[PDB]
């Protein structure tokens, strides 16, 4: 049984890490690249990149704890806690060589502590479409001159008393379609079938809660990263961001320059937040080229 179709030549499997059963999809041969999805999605957002990247690499795409088919974390949802699970997973598949990391949205939150604390384990880094948790996120406006902002969900999801779960219950599919499309520039790629699959996955009660627990731990992650960022990242890094409605635009590279000594950035025109789906062809090309150097 699978929540999402597994591409040909890939294996869907599970690995217990610190008492948490993690789901991942793996395929290919060569040095390891781990792809980490973000909120509202699963490993499947990578399914168009994975077959191309697998021609030169071993590719592994886990489901974040609590999302997709991965059990919730048993320590907590802060970046430093979740990063442990992903680090141990990656190192079991690349124990003796550094591996590459590609992360999108809250996949950044859940991998940054692993990267800065284990820099020798990371050969090349690709981060797309989310801030690394730090006090810059407190500057995003709640409301804008064009109406609804793209970041009010930070506070909705972080609200106590299970506000988000209570309001979204019974409206999971409606809410996720409006979240995804409001953060998109190219909405056509989110078919009814694709939205159905993503909605069924995050509508599992533990996955709905897990989704918001990442935001409830966001301030903890900010405080953790205030300490961790005293060490600059030294490996080659690439940032990608959407230049259209819904994306991070120039913020992504600008923030990353404060964290990384060796960074190149690209802003993809006509793309919002969901780069692997909205702009598959240019995003895949940029990722493959950067990792193949």
């Amino acid at each position: 049984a699978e929540e999402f179709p597994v591409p040909n030549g890939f294996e869907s499997a599970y690995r217990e890490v610190d008492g948490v059963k993690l789901h991942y999809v793996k395929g290919g041969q060569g040095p390891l690249v781990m792809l980490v999805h973000g909120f509202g999605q699963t490993w499947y957002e990578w399914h168009q990149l994975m077959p191309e990247l697998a021609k030169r690499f071993t590719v592994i795409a886990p489901d974040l704890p609590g999302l997709g088919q991965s059990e919730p974390p048993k320590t907590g949802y802060s970046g430093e806690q979740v990063a442990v699970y992903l680090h141990k997973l990656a190192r079991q598949f690349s124990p003796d060589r550094p591996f590459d990391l590609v992360a999108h949205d809250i996949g950044i939150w859940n991998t940054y502590p692993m990267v800065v604390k284990n820099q020798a384990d990371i050969a090349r880094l690709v981060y797309m479409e989310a801030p690394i948790p730090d006090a810059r996120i407190y500057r995003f406006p709640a409301f804008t001159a064009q109406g609804e902002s793209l970041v009010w969900h930070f506070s909705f999801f972080a609200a106590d008393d299970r506000l988000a779960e209570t309001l979204i219950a019974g409206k999971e599919r409606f809410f996720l379609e409006h979240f995804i499309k409001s953060h998109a520039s190219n909405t056509e790629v989110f078919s009814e079938r694709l939205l159905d699959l993503y909605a069924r996955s995050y509508a599992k009660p533990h996955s709905l809660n897990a989704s918001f627990e990442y935001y409830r731990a966001l301030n903890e992650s900010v405080r953790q990263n205030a300490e961790l960022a005293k060490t600059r990242l030294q490996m080659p890094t690439m940032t990608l961001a959407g230049g259209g409605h819904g994306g991070m635009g120039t913020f992504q590279l600008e923030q990353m320059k404060a964290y990384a000594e060796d960074v190149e950035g690209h802003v993809l025109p006509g793309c919002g937040h969901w780069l692997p789906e909205e702009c598959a062809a240019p995003m895949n090309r940029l990722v493959i080229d950067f990792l193949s150097r």
Epitope: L150, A184, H245, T250, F251, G270
Partner: nanobody, 124 residues
């Protein structure tokens, strides 16, 4: 690309121009207004960016600052130019265009060929 709202108006009066495109074109581009007077070069008027997580930005040319404002209606894929305190020198054909960012609009980049525009005539 649908441009409308122009017309004849007395000096001191007001007009609101609109520019509507397809959803993908609207969301993929900073949107801007330009104008060309009978024997002058085409002129940048105003622009508004797409919405990013940081917010948005909008700029107006010095010649209309404090009188014209620009804003998006993302539900309608329409950008509006609100024109207050109109002057005879605002008489021109007004054209809408888009570019990959707000600076490219002012640099010469344009994501579509110019449309028909909309005529604004301000009588003294």
């Amino acid at each position: 690309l649908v441009e409308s709202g122009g017309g004849l108006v007395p000096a001191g009066g007001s007009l609101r121009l609109s520019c509507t495109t397809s959803e993908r074109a609207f969301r993929s581009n900073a949107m801007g207004w330009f104008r060309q007077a009978p024997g002058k070069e085409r002129e940048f008027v105003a622009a508004v960016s797409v919405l990013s997580w940081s917010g948005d930005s909008a700029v107006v040319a010095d010649s209309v600052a404090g009188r014209f404002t620009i804003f998006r209606d993302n539900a309608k894929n329409t950008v509006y130019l609100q024109m207050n305190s109109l002057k005879p020198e605002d008489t021109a054909v007004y054209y809408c265009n888009g570019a990959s960012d707000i600076g490219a609009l002012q640099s010469g980049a344009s994501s579509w060929s110019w449309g028909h525009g909309t005529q604004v005539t301000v009588s003294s």
